Design a protein around this ligand. Structure first.
Ligand SMILES: Nc1ncnc2c1ncn2[C@@H]1O[C@H](COP(=O)(O)OP(=O)(O)O)[C@@H](O)[C@H]1O
Ligand SMILES: [Ca+2]
Ligand SMILES: [Ca+2]
Ligand SMILES: [Mg+2]
Lengths: 154, 363
């Protein structure tokens, strides 16, 4: 059409990035994230981003959705940090959980200045990078999961 | 505080509450007035009384063209359907991409100045559908009653240079079915008859995998024919109209448009994106909206995109069963997130900035 006359005239702009960066400041889960090399994991629980304790990292409920931030030193500089952000979608996760995990992955990306590379990891379709995150035998799928945040309209 | 999510389709209002898994109110986006020239009726009641009314849609091709009647639609949604006080509810609205800027400016003005909402946001429909599918990267084909749009999205950001739009969707297909049914000697002309034909289309139409083969099948025997009982009790029969009607999506020249069909436009949108992301778009074509509900459409899209794309390209069409509601559902999810709501326009911000603020907050 004529993009400039339209409701998408400001897509792709610095302004769009600025507004979304500000929104990402209002999620407590990101405070302190990505500050050292390692893996940080959160689970979506009724729309909220909830930390997974380190002792459970690598075990994932098949009924749930998760965000996994892998912080590492890039080849270009052994003293600075780069990021892969994976969102893991269990085979039985509900639509609210997967949609929140996707949205909040983008938000964590925003919070980290756009630097993370995003990976969608459906159970049974996990990328080679995702498989490499956990020590031998470390990736374990657990039965069940937390209840959906949706109210079911009858 | 519960947000309201209202997806104002060209054809149907889908409205309800953030955090619900489906819209609680779904009804025709129509105002009816006496066909012989309270004094008006809205929604389901207009439909129920269409024997005596002329029906008008305030939204045409995704754009509000009758603001007074659109206000009646919104008033009906809040007060008669959902039975809420709009001044108590932050409200999420939706729009097709590539609409003129003034459309959302006036949406914003009416929501704050007439309905006194405490906060609001206007989202692009295809973006909501992608999140409803659990993705941050993919290309959405959204087709309702007014607009067919293609939006490629990478890592959560829509790529504006590659967005496509066709003002050809369900209402044009209904009108075409009305036209071609005259070949059988049927006469569907009035606004009430348009609604009958819309129902015929929804119940009996399908997309042929190979259009020319299907035309030959239809002439060889009656195997593809179906019957349909009109509201007056007359039973009609339709044959190749079942698949000629939606063929128009692939061949817009059926209605005299020179446009590329929906397969070619999807391909063209992908081809406007950086080469290194195209494989991810081809593997993540997500369909949303009622006009994507024809039986056979996903298989036809798969076939046509395969013929256009490089011979080794992995192509996948994702066609969620609830895709008549995917936009609404994505809105329900995002409006349940406090950080998404942090971006919404507040009443105070509107009072100080006016309608222009919508372009600085809603992306
Ligand atoms: N099963 C179906 N087959 C074909 N078209 C359909 C079907 N169901 C709904 N539609 C069409 O989809 C449109 C309504 O879908 P919807 O996504 O709510 O549109 P909008 O958002 O524009 O109101 C109408 O044109 C309707 O006739
Ligand atoms: Ca769950
Ligand atoms: Ca990024
Ligand atoms: Mg729609």
């Amino acid at each position: 059409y004529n993009i400039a006359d339209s409701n998408i005239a400001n897509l792709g702009t610095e302004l769009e990035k600025k507004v979304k960066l500000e929104a990402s400041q209002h999620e407590d889960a990101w405070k302190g994230a990505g500050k050292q090399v390692g893996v940080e994991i959160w689970r979506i629980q009724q729309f909220k981003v909830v930390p997974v304790p380190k002792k459970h990292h690598g075990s994932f409920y098949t009924g749930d959705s998760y965000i996994v931030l892998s912080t590492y030193h890039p080849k270009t500089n052994p003293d600075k940090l780069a990021y892969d952000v994976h969102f893991w979608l269990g085979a039985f996760t509900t639509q609210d959980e997967a949609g929140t995990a996707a949205y909040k992955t983008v938000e964590l990306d925003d919070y980290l200045g756009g630097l993370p590379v995003q990976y969608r990891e459906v159970q049974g379709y996990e990328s080679e990078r995702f498989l490499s995150l956990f020590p031998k035998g470390g990736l374990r799928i657990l039965d069940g999961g937390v209840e959906t945040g949706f109210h079911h309209v009858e | 505080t519960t947000a309201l999510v209202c997806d104002n389709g060209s054809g149907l209002v889908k409205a309800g509450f953030a955090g619900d898994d489906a819209p609680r109110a779904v009804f025709p986006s129509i105002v009816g007035r006496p066909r012989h020239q309270k004094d008006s009726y809205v929604g389901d009641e207009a439909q129920s009384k269409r024997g005596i009314l002329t029906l008008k849609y305030p939204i045409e091709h995704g754009i509000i063209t009758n603001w007074d009647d659109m206000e009646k639609i919104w008033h009906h949604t809040f007060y008669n359907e959902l039975r809420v006080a709009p001044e108590e509810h932050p409200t999420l609205l939706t729009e097709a991409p590539l609409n003129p800027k003034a459309n959302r400016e006036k949406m914003t003005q009416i929501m704050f100045e007439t309905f006194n909402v405490p906060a609001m946001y206007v989202a692009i429909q295809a973006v909501l559908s992608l999140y409803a599918s659990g993705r941050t990267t993919g290309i959405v084909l959204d087709s309702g009653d007014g607009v067919t749009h293609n939006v490629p999205i990478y890592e959560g950001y829509a790529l504006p240079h590659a967005i496509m739009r066709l003002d050809l969707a369900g209402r044009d297909l209904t009108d075409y079915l009305m036209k071609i049914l005259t070949e059988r000697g049927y006469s569907f002309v009035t606004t009430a008859e348009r609604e009958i034909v819309r129902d015929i289309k929804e119940k009996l139409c399908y997309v042929a995998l190979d259009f020319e083969n299907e035309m030959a099948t239809a002439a060889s025997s009656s195997s593809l024919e179906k019957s349909y009982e009109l509201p007056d009790g007359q039973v009609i029969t339709i044959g190749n109209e079942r698949f000629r009607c939606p063929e128009t999506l692939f061949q817009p020249s059926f209605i005299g448009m020179e446009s590329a069909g929906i397969h070619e436009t999807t391909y063209n949108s992908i081809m406007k994106c950086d080469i290194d992301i195209r494989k991810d778009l081809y593997a993540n074509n997500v369909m949303s909206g009622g006009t994507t509900m024809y039986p056979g459409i996903a298989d036809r899209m798969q076939k046509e995109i395969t013929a256009l794309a490089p011979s080794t390209m992995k192509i996948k069409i994702i066609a969620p069963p609830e895709r008549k509601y995917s936009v609404w559902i994505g809105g329900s999810i995002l409006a349940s997130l406090s950080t998404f709501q942090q971006m919404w326009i507040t009443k105070q911000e509107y009072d100080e900035a006016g309608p222009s603020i919508v372009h600085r907050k809603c992306f």
